[PDB]
Paper text:
The Pden_5119 protein oxidizes NADH with oxygen under mediation by the bound flavin mononucleotide (FMN) and may be involved in the maintenance of the cellular redox pool. The findings so far indicate that the Pden_5119 protein shares functional properties with both flavin reductases, which use flavin as a dissociable cosubstrate, and flavoprotein oxidases, which contain flavin as a permanently bound cofactor. It follows a sequentially ordered mechanism where FMN binds before NADH and the binary complex enzyme-reduced flavin formed after the hydride transfer persists for a long enough time to be oxidized by molecular oxygen. Structural and kinetic data suggest that His-117 plays a role in the binding and positioning of the isoalloxazine ring of FMN, Lys-82 fixes the nicotinamide ring of NADH to support the proS-hydride transfer, and Arg-116 with its positive charge promotes the reaction between dioxygen and reduced flavin.
In order to understand the structural basis for Pden_5119 catalysis, single crystals of this enzyme were prepared and used to collect diffraction data (resolution range 48.75–3.1 Å). The monomer takes a flavodoxin-like fold with a central β sheet made up of five parallel strands in the order 21345 which is sandwiched between helices 1 and 5 on one side and helices 2, 3, and 4 on the other side. The oligomeric state in solution was analyzed by means of small-angle X-ray scattering (SAXS). Ab initio modeling using the SAXS data obtained at a protein concentration of 1.5 mg·mL−1 (73 μM in monomer) yielded an envelope that has space for the dimer. Therefore, we can conclude that the dimer represents the major species in the solution. Despite co-crystallization and soaking trials, we could not obtain crystals of Pden_5119 containing bound FMN. The FMN molecule position was therefore predicted by in silico docking analysis. Further inspection of the isoalloxazine environment implicated three amino acid residues, His-117, Lys-82, and Arg-116, as potentially involved in catalysis. The imidazole ring of His-117 is positioned to form a hydrogen bond with the N3 nitrogen of FMN similar to the case for homologous His-112 and His-116 residues in SsuE and EmoB.
Author numbering: 1 to 50, 56 to 148, 152 to 178, 190 to 193
Amino acid sequence: MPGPRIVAFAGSWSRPSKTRSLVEEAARRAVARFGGSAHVFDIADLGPDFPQDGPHTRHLDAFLAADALIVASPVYKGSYTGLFKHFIDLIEPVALVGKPVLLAATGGGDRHALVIEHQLRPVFGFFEAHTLATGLYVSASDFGLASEAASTRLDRAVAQFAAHLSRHDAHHHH
């Protein structure tokens, strides 16, 4: 087990979205630090309110087996999207304990940046997941499309993955 298996999920269904560039520029820092062959999938390659033999090659089975998770959503209506939460509503309630999650979010401006603490961290603390100390809200300043002071926040948030894996990564029941 020399390399972690990373998955990526972005809650933007559109093809050339700015959320898919954020989740693609997340594993490369981990893959290039330590990892192999990240599963990066957009929510267009999903079963979005259609389990029954769908594209659960690229949603469910890669998500639950991953050693590291990066999760992202466009900020719609002061919170994440609905199609993002429909994917989360299908997870078993205790399925992601001991799992590192990196929170990310894209929006219109620099406003609405309490979605990391008040919207995404309560949902992934419901799963009792190892939420990292650095979630990152980005504005529409990116054109691995990135720009200033979000790249250093992203590179230093993936550095919090390998900092709880040292010496060869050392009433309810599922």
